Amino acid sequence: SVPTKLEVVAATPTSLLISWDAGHWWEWVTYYRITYGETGGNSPVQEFTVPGYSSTATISGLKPGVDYTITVYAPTSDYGSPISINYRT
Amino acid sequence: SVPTKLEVVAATPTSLLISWDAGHWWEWVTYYRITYGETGGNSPVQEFTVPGYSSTATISGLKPGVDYTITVYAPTSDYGSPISINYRT
Amino acid sequence: NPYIYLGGAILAEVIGTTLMKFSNGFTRLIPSMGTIICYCASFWLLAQTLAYIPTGIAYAIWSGVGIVLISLLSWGFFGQRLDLPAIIGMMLICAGVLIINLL
Amino acid sequence: NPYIYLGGAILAEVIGTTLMKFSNGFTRLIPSMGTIICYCASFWLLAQTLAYIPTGIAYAIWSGVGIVLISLLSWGFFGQRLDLPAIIGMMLICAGVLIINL
Ligand SMILES: c1ccc([P+](c2ccccc2)(c2ccccc2)c2ccccc2)cc1
């Protein structure tokens, strides 16, 4: 279910601006955690959390040209599967 | 009774690094506030706060050759009278 | 008058406690906020009412009206009655309280 | 298991309110930081022990073991034991806890 529609709004070569349909009224969660790492798995994944009232997040400091995998989770898996996406900067 | 021993460690013509004996582990207050202003009173004094676990502070943005009245206040007056000192940059 | 802020602080905790059962372990926004909001309002009314009312009359009234108004909500938003031997076990917990406070 | 974290939150609160009576207007940093840690720990210990034991059941045992562990702590270290013919009232709270227990 939540979240929905994880899209990259702005995309500087070193920063991705991601938003998501946070849900509604009752399905609003307290915090989202967002994971971004290299798409080849050569490294582990970086990770931050964001207050659950906000539905956007700024992922800064990447490497240009490289494709990335952006994941957005919920506090628990009881809200649904994580909506993971990709983007080449 | 607290805090105690307000003095100026380092003193540039425009800055006054001040410290104070916090006390002991079981007698730390949540915060202090530092009041520094011109010793005469041509304008209001300057004011800020410092977390209570720290015991030193640095006052910047002063005018050289001028003497100042630095006063440190506890969170409340229960902890005793505020300690005030004077220093000429 | 201070007995009216009492129930206002009792009922506020009564609500926030039931909103806490709804917050999924503080992982659902709005039920997590409401619990934080309620326990603030139930704290502030407690200060205005125990500012000068005895802290044994206020506790016992809270410990009883609260032991009822949240169990009737737990049963209103679910049920369970006496899952384990006795509901009276909570009625006599409420009794042993009212004698180390008032006696 | 559920009656383990219920009492663990009672201990956190009992120390939470006491460390608050020691500190002034939340002003003494060390005992005040204890209260916030004691409260925030107990706040999350109750939310978890609430999904297993009904709300009204835990609320009872909560208020029960509280004043138990409060007057037991009031007399053990501070003194008081006022209304000494109330240790029967401590045996009463125990019995009610027992006949709702496992
Ligand atoms: C952390 C701190 C305080 C409470 P409680 C409480 C009472 C009844 C049921 C659950 C929790 C409390 C207060 C005083 C003594 C014992 C317990 C609490 C918190 C806010 C307002 C009212 C009561 C809980 C967790």
Total residue length of chain D: 102
**Can you tell me whether residue D60 is helix, strand or coil?**
helix
Q: Which two tokens stand for residue D67?
A: 């004043």
Domain that holds residue B73: 1-89
Are C63 and C19 contacting, i.e. CB atoms less than 8 angstroms apart? no
Q: Which helix (H) or strand (E) holds B9?
A: strand B4-11
What is the DSSP secondary structure assignment for residue A42, as one 8-state letter?
S
Residue A49 forms beta bridges with which residues?
A: A33
* Cα separation values, C97 from B61, C102, D86, Å: 61, 9, 10
Q: How many separate domains does chain B show?
A: 1
Query: Experimental method used, please?
Result: X-ray
Question: CB distance from B80 to chain D under 8 Å?
Answer: no
CA distance A85 to B35: 53
**Can you tell me whether residue A16 is helix, strand or coil?**
strand
Are C99 and D84 contacting, i.e. CB atoms less than 8 angstroms apart? no
**Can you tell me whether residue C6 is helix, strand or coil?**
helix
What order of strands is seen across the sheet that includes strand B4-11?
B4-11, B16-21, B56-59
Alpha-carbon torsion angle B3, B5, B11, B14, nearest 10? 30
Of the candidates D72, D56, D82, D59, the residue with the CA atom closest to the CA atom of residue D18: D72
The beta strands (E) that lie in chain A are given as: 4-12, 15-21, 31-38, 46-51, 56-60, 67-73, 85-88
N-terminal to C-terminal alpha carbon distance within chain B: 28
Q: Which helix (H) or strand (E) holds A51?
A: strand A46-51
Q: Which two tokens stand for residue B24?
A: 């002991």
**Can you tell me whether residue D82 is helix, strand or coil?**
coil
SS (H, E, C) chain B: CCCEEEEEEEECCCCEEEEEECCCHHHCECEEEEEEEECCCCCCCEEEEEECCCCEEEECCCCCCCEEEEEEECCCHHHCCCEEEEEEC
Which residue has the least CA distance to atom 9 on ligand 1?
D59
Side-chain-facing half-sphere of B3: CA atoms under 13 Å? 30
Alpha helices in C23-87 (DSSP H): 31-50, 57-69, 71-74
Q: What residues line ligand 1, using a CB cutoff of 6 Å?
A: C 13, 17, 39, 42-43; D 13, 16-17, 39, 42-43, 46, 59, 62-63, 66
